[PDB]
Structure 1
Amino acid sequence: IVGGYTCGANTVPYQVSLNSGYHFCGGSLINSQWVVSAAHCYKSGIQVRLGEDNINVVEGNEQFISASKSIVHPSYNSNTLNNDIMLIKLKSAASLNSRVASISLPTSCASAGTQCLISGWGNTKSSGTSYPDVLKCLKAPILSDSSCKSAYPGQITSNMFCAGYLEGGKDSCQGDSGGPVVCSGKLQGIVSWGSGCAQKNKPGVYTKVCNYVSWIKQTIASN
């Protein structure tokens, strides 16, 4: 997260760190056995790390659970990043408590102007490299589809939305991918992509989770 702030330990209890020997993507715990992340975060041998703050120190509230099954969206297109969503079933159920909790799926789509909380252990530099060991947070409003489509001509589909600042300075970044974009307690987006981090007029693009609730529910119910 660029231009964000330190969230604080376990203040984003649904945030998960997808680990394959190291943190590579974020995710959101949607229930005790399921994590939602970006399909572009797909990897084999994903160990889901819950209750994380400092990803390099065992602080005592972590739950490291290996994935049993990964389900990338049937229409995920790695070229356009359309349908950039993936479900990860945990081998064993996460013990949900105050530091590790699920985030609610949206009942409706969030709109432009909606303020959201984006979190991740991604790069904090817009021009440079610095990865935080502790979870970073960023408050960013969902931008209007017009601003989004104008920033990314012909690249924004109905399953995407821009969130952030057109002035740049604040944005998701590498390593934040798959992370949650929660607005008013509901997971409305998944850190999907951007042309860079915190670039002027190039807001981050997120997977519009509200378009996948049916798929998410149906998938979970049958796996």
Structure 2
Amino acid sequence: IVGGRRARPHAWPFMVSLQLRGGHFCGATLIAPNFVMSAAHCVANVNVRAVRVVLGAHNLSRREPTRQVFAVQRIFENGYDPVNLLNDIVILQLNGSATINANVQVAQLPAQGRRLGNGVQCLAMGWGLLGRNRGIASVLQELNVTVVTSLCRRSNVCTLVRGRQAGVCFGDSGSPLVCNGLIHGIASFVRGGCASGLYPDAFAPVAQFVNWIDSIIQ
């Protein structure tokens, strides 16, 4: 997150960090005690057995007893298209269930087909880079963004910070976009580099996949 601010500790208890050995590589969202949701492109090329799902984290650079670490038991996708970045969504089943507490909680999803109009105010978040080639975050960051339709596609939810070279950056793939308490996006791609200040960021539209998600997790 470029141009954001630090989130309050465990302000967003559905926020997930996907990690390899070398550290955080993508964000995700806890959608059930044993399921998280992320971008399909985050895991397309990784060794899934080596992925660790970290719940209840805040400062990735410190040891946190609030954390609960899981492995991936199974992958679910629905028509991912890496050439056109359509349906850029993946559900990872955990090898166990989280224990739900103040620091680890399930997110609320919109109803199927709900479409956000331009001007809706949202919050992006994640542990991605703080500048367009700078270092990844230690403390989870959050950013006020606005839904825009101009320079977007109908197949995405796009967001912009007017007049500011701010937005998601490397390591924010997979992280939720929270609008009105609901997860409406999954960070999917940027245009013109991170924080162009010209082109909005693009999120996988969660509401378009809600029936498929419910197929999986219930």
Q: Normalised by the size of structure 1, how large is the TM-score?
A: 0.90
**How far is 1:148 from its partner?**
2.7
3-state secondary structure, aligned to 1:76: coil
Aligned to 2:122, the other structure's residue is in SS state: strand
Aligned equivalent of 2:147: 142
Map Cα deviations across residues 75-124 of structure 1 (whole Å, 9 max, x no partner).
Answer: 11111111100001110001111111111111233221111111100011
Gaps of 5+ in 1: 150-155
Instruction: Look up the equivalent residue of 1:159 and give its one-letter code.
Output: S
In 1: Cα distance, 2:78 partner to 2:120 partner:
29
The equivalent residue for 1:55 is 60
- Which of these residues, 178, 183, 186, is aligned with residue 182 of structure 2? 186
Mapping of residues 32-181 of structure 1, within 5 Å:
32-42=33-43, 43=46, 44-45=48-49, 46-71=51-76, 73-107=77-111, 108-126=114-132, 128-144=133-149, 147-149=150-152, 156=153, 158-181=154-177
Which residue of structure 1 aligns with residue 197 of structure 2? Answer: 200
Q: Which residue in 1 is equivalent to 2:15?
A: 15
| Equivalent position SS for 1:80 | coil
In structure 2, the residue matched to 1:217 is 214
CA contact (8 A) 1:36 1:86 kept: yes
Task: Give the whole-Å Cα distance in 2 for the aligned partners of 1:200 and 1:186.
Answer: 26
Separation in 1, partners of 2:210, 2:179: 15
Task: Report sequence identity in percent.
Answer: 33
Residue of structure 2 in register with 1:153 after alignment:
none
Corresponding residue SS for 2:87: coil
For residues 168 and 83 of structure 1, the distance between their equivalents in structure 2, rounded to whole angstroms, comes to 28
Cα deviation, 1:124-152, whole Å, max 9, x if unaligned, reads: 103x31211110001101112xx133xxx
Amino acid at match of 1:116: C
Residue 166 (structure 1) shift: 4.7
Distance in 2 between the 1:169 and 1:13 partners? 27
TM-score, with normalisation over the residues of structure 2?
A: 0.92
* SS of match in other structure, 1:99: coil
Count of matched residue pairs: 210
- The answer to whether residue 30 in structure 2 is matched with residue 25 in structure 1 is no
After superposing on structure 2, the runs of 4+ consecutive aligned residues of structure 1 that deviate more than 3 Å are none
